[PDB]
Amino acid sequence: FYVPAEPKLAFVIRIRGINGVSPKVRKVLQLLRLRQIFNGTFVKLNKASINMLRIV
Amino acid sequence: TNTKGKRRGTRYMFSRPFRKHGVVPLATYMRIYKKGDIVDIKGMGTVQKGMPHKCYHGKTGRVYNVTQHAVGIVVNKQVKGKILAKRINVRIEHIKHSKSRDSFLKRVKENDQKKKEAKEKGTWVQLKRQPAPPREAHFVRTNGKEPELLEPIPYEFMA
Amino acid sequence: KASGTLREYKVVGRCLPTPKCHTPPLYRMRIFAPNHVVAKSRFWYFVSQLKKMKKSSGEIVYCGQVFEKSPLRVKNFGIWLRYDSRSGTHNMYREYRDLTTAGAVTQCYRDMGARHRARAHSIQIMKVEEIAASKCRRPAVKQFHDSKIKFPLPHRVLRRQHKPRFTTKRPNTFF
RNA sequence: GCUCUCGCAGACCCGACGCCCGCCACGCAGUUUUAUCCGGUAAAGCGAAUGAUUAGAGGUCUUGGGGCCGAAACGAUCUCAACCUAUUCUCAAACUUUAAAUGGGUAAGAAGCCCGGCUCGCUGGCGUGGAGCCGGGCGUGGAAUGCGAGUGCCUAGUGGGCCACUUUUGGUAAGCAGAACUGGCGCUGCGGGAUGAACCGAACGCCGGGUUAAGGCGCCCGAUGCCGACGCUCAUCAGACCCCAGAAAAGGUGUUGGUUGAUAUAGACAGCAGGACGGUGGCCAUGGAAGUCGGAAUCCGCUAAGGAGUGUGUAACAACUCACCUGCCGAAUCAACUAGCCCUGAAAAUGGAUGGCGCUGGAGCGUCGGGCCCAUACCCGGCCGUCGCCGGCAGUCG
RNA sequence: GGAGCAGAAGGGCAAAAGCUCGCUUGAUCUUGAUUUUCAGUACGAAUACAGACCGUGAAAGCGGGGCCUCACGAUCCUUC
RNA sequence: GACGUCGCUUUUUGAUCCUUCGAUGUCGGCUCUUCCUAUCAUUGUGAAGCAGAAUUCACCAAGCGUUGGAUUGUUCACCC
RNA sequence: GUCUACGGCCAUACCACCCUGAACGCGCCCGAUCUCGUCUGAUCUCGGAAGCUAAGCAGGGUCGGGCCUGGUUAGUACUUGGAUGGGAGACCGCCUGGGAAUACCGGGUGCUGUAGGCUU
Numbered sequence A: 001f002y003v004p005a006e007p008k009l010a011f012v013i014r015i016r017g018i019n020g021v022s023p024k025v026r027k028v029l030q031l032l033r034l035r036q037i038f039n040g041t042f043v044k045l046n047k048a049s050i051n052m053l054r055i056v
Numbered sequence B: 001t002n003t004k005g006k007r008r009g010t011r012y013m014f015s016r017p018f019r020k021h022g023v024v025p026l027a028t029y030m031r032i033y034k035k036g037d038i039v040d041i042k043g044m045g046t047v048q049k050g051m052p053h054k055c056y057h058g059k060t061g062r063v064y065n066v067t068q069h070a071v072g073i074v075v076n077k078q079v080k081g082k083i084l085a086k087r088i089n090v091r092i093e094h095i096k097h098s099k100s101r102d103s104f105l106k107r108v109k110e111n112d113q114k115k116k117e118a119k120e121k122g123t124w125v126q127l128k129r130q131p132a133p134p135r136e137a138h139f140v141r142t143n144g145k146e147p148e149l150l151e152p153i154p155y156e157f158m159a
Numbered sequence C: 001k002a003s004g005t006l007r008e009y010k011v012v013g014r015c016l017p018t019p020k021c022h023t024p025p026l027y028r029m030r031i032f033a034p035n036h037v038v039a040k041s042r043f044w045y046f047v048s049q050l051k052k053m054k055k056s057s058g059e060i061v062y063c064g065q066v067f068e069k070s071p072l073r074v075k076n077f078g079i080w081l082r083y084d085s086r087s088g089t090h091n092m093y094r095e096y097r098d099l100t101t102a103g104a105v106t107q108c109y110r111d112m113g114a115r116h117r118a119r120a121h122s123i124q125i126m127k128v129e130e131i132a133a134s135k136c137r138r139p140a141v142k143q144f145h146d147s148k149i150k151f152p153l154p155h156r157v158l159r160r161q162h163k164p165r166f167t168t169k170r171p172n173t174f175f
Numbered sequence D: 001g002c003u004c005u006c007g008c009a010g011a012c013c014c015g016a017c018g019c020c021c022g023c024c025a026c027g028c029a030g031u032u033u034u035a036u037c038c039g040g041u042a043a044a045g046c047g048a049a050u051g052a053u054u055a056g057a058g059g060u061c062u063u064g065g066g067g068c069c070g071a072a073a074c075g076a077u078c079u080c081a082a083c084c085u086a087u088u089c090u091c092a093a094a095c096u097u098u099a100a101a102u103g104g105g106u107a108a109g110a111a112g113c114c115c116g117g118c119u120c121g122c123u124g125g126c127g128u129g130g131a132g133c134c135g136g137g138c139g140u141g142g143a144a145u146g147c148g149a150g151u152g153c154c155u156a157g158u159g160g161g162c163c164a165c166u167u168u169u170g171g172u173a174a175g176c177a178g179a180a181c182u183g184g185c186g187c188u189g190c191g192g193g194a195u196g197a198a199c200c201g202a203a204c205g206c207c208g209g210g211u212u213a214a215g216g217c218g219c220c221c222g223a224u225g226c227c228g229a230c231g232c233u234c235a236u237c238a239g240a241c242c243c244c245a246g247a248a249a250a251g252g253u254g255u256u257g258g259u260u261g262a263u264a265u266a267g268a269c270a271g272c273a274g275g276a277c278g279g280u281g282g283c284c285a286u287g288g289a290a291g292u293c294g295g296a297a298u299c300c301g302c303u304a305a306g307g308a309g310u311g312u313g314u315a316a317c318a319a320c321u322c323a324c325c326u327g328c329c330g331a332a333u334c335a336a337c338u339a340g341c342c343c344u345g346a347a348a349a350u351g352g353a354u355g356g357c358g359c360u361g362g363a364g365c366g367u368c369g370g371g372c373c374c375a376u377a378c379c380c381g382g383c384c385g386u387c388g389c390c391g392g393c394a395g396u397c398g
Numbered sequence E: 001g002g003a004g005c006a007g008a009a010g011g012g013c014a015a016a017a018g019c020u021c022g023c024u025u026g027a028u029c030u031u032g033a034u035u036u037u038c039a040g041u042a043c044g045a046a047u048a049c050a051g052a053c054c055g056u057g058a059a060a061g062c063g064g065g066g067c068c069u070c071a072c073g074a075u076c077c078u079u080c
Numbered sequence F: 001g002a003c004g005u006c007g008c009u010u011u012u013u014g015a016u017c018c019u020u021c022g023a024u025g026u027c028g029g030c031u032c033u034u035c036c037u038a039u040c041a042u043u044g045u046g047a048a049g050c051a052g053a054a055u056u057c058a059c060c061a062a063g064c065g066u067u068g069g070a071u072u073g074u075u076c077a078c079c080c
Numbered sequence G: 001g002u003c004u005a006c007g008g009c010c011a012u013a014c015c016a017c018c019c020u021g022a023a024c025g026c027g028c029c030c031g032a033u034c035u036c037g038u039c040u041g042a043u044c045u046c047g048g049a050a051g052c053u054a055a056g057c058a059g060g061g062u063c064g065g066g067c068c069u070g071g072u073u074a075g076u077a078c079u080u081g082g083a084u085g086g087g088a089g090a091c092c093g094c095c096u097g098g099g100a101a102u103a104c105c106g107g108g109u110g111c112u113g114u115a116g117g118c119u120u
């Protein structure tokens, strides 16, 4: 079996609005620069980034 | 409701561990503390003199003052909406050092020796640390044998 | 887990190679899922219930769709499943007639939702295999086990009830 | 307001023009990562301490009762005890060996590193130790991601709150009372929930186009007027969508699926039927058996198979004749569970409410597909203002 | 340690912090710092020091009240 | 229908304090209408430890009726 | 290979019972003149050296008890975050992550610092 490399690039899209958001989720989303709905960006995948995606 | 006594709620934290009572071991007394280093605050309950408050139990500060039996520590405490640096006199049975700062200092010295060897030998080497990269494509040998077929079990009621 | 029409995947995975066992064993499941992302999720679910293994300390070494081997021959399928009602959980054995294994499993999902109000997150498919005609138990399949089978289509309900919407002649149901 | 930071780019020009390679600001953060401590809740435990608590078993001592023939060394050893030992059932907000998840703190460098020298009245076997000071050299700026920060004065209003997920105290409970955490409402319109401070979606300058969320798409009412898919369900109170606006224990040979067991060509099941019974009713009991009776009982029948009957309402010889098969009938049947929908359980006061009309090859329930509908949300465009760039123009220099 | 440590409870404690003797008055005189409640105000309580004068012990040391968590009180006036 | 256990109702009394204190006339009777059904009678039935008569338990059922007095302000009550 | 003296971590070191101990040592042991303490030279203090490993102590043993460390229990119990999930509720399933503790079954049973001895 050939296990390929798990990817280093992700595209993230904020898909929920800004009403009634937890503060930790709020801080992680604005560290991801997702301040609006449908507001995607590129992230580089490692442990720290994957855990804050798991948060939001 | 409740009292504002100085040891309210400290039934378990100021107690001793199980089968750990009695005489305090003497290495805790013969540690040394220079002013500037990072110490953990725990606060055992065999010694009642100089013991820290329950808000400072389980905290971490730096030493600013050394006396005969105690140490002045600068600790961050969070009052309602601000963090402020309190100065507490705590005894050496209640404190111990910080391996986090110890680990940082030994990787500082490792960085310095590594930069010296790189400069003398004429290379460029990595000094920072990077957060756990992805997982570097690879082959998985089956060693000829077929992978075992797993299958969910039926339901039986035991307990 | 929602649905659609299902595909069968084989998902092979293993624990991560620690420097204690440099070659951990591989495990393989057949998993009926809408797509391969759901397939990998259901793999980690099932293998975490069976073995002490989680998605963090493990990897998928293969996840690939099993195509139907003979998608032009009508087969009988026996499904061994477990599910849970509003009360406790039950084992169950169903039989279907289909061309594809994933088609019969999809048939089983819609049938369990119809007859027992059971949801797909409640259902766990634990075995699916191809039964011949002489080994079936259910009369709804054994009645189709006949070489000279013959029946009409008795009461043909009109379907284009809106083309036209207003006609002058009443429809006919005998054909 | 102030103190700083990034820097403005070289008329139109055009990333750059210094010293093999290399470097691209600082600090900060309702965030992660890497290290490193902290904790006693959830769970668990009681053949671990403290308390609580169920049941047997085994042993030999004793202010155990006592134990029948032992006063006589209870000649004795037994019945019971206590007690001990090994087990066993079940618990703890104010118990606990163990012990999470989520969490709290600290660290992740130039205020750092490493060389010399000097001062000390502190410390001292010592040139000590510790602290301070003066010089010098080291930049790969020593995890990720994001971001301009610091700092002072003056200051209004408020100090009745309320609701929701989860946790949680009192209370039978409450649209009750009281806490924790986050979000909301208050202070907030808009799409959906028929209707509604708080639910679900989404937060709003004035407009055009496009597309969506939550929610829908028989008609009211925009959208399924799809030749939509597979089933389930008939209700003489059907059912019909977060909060939410109404039901349980218990049942059903209503129908649908399933689990487990059993019987059957040495012929099932149901019906057409023959011997289908006997001393011994031995025993039991004559207030009851030479069949069928509250009690303990229970055999052999001289039998193709027959009781101490479940058959014939009995003290009765009543006595018809079922149980057991062989001849027809010739292939599947029976039982106990289980859970879907429906039904029973199911009674209130003006006439009434899946929102209404109605709907039953669904306009119901479950699992799904393709379309489609539209919010003040998102995209593109226009216009208005605010903020920022401390942006550009004094070169009107044909 | 299932005892005791003045008392409520919790923690702590064994050649102890318990019990018994011996000697004493660190329960004294002073300035500041800190913690606790906290507005980072005060009181109360407490913790590290520093400067005297002492106690005890062979000594290192320990001691400015009670093993720790409670046991207490501004201005004005009076009194020493 | 004991030991248990599941409900309904708002004709009891509590619990609560949401509305009303710049005012919703506060007990009972009299009068008069309408509704409910958890049916006392009457219509049609089923059951009985229903022979008849009387009665009891259920079902469809609220169409129709459910009185005159003594005492008490009484609602309730008790008697003729 | 060990031991004394002082220790550090403080049971893998404890507890119960059994076996072995060369040489130095550590003890047991002999005594009360002095020092010093007792009701008692038993303890404490002092002065010794005839005998001894009996005991302490050390090492080893025990299908040992405890303790330590793994496995199992178990991806179970519990839990972060999510849903216009289910169910009349009580509660339960799923998605995303984390993840225990008995019973039961293994293995182990003191390491080590400074100074000074003995062991041909």
Ligand SMILES: [Mg+2]
Binding pocket: A019, A020
């Ligand atoms: Mg919302």
Ligand SMILES: [Mg+2]
Binding pocket: B001, B002
């Ligand atoms: Mg309280």
Ligand SMILES: [Mg+2]
Binding pocket: B001, B002, B003
């Ligand atoms: Mg209290």
Ligand SMILES: [Mg+2]
Binding pocket: none
């Ligand atoms: Mg004190």
Ligand SMILES: [Mg+2]
Binding pocket: none
């Ligand atoms: Mg607690």
Ligand SMILES: [Mg+2]
Binding pocket: none
């Ligand atoms: Mg618990």
Ligand SMILES: [Mg+2]
Binding pocket: D046
């Ligand atoms: Mg116990």
Ligand SMILES: [Mg+2]
Binding pocket: D160
């Ligand atoms: Mg007010």
Ligand SMILES: [Mg+2]
Binding pocket: none
């Ligand atoms: Mg409340």
Ligand SMILES: [Mg+2]
Binding pocket: none
């Ligand atoms: Mg207001």
Ligand SMILES: [Mg+2]
Binding pocket: none
């Ligand atoms: Mg606001």
Ligand SMILES: [Mg+2]
Binding pocket: D188
């Ligand atoms: Mg709003």
Ligand SMILES: [Mg+2]
Binding pocket: none
């Ligand atoms: Mg609306």
Ligand SMILES: [Mg+2]
Binding pocket: D193
């Ligand atoms: Mg509604």
Ligand SMILES: [Mg+2]
Binding pocket: none
């Ligand atoms: Mg528009």
Ligand SMILES: [Mg+2]
Binding pocket: D216
């Ligand atoms: Mg509508």
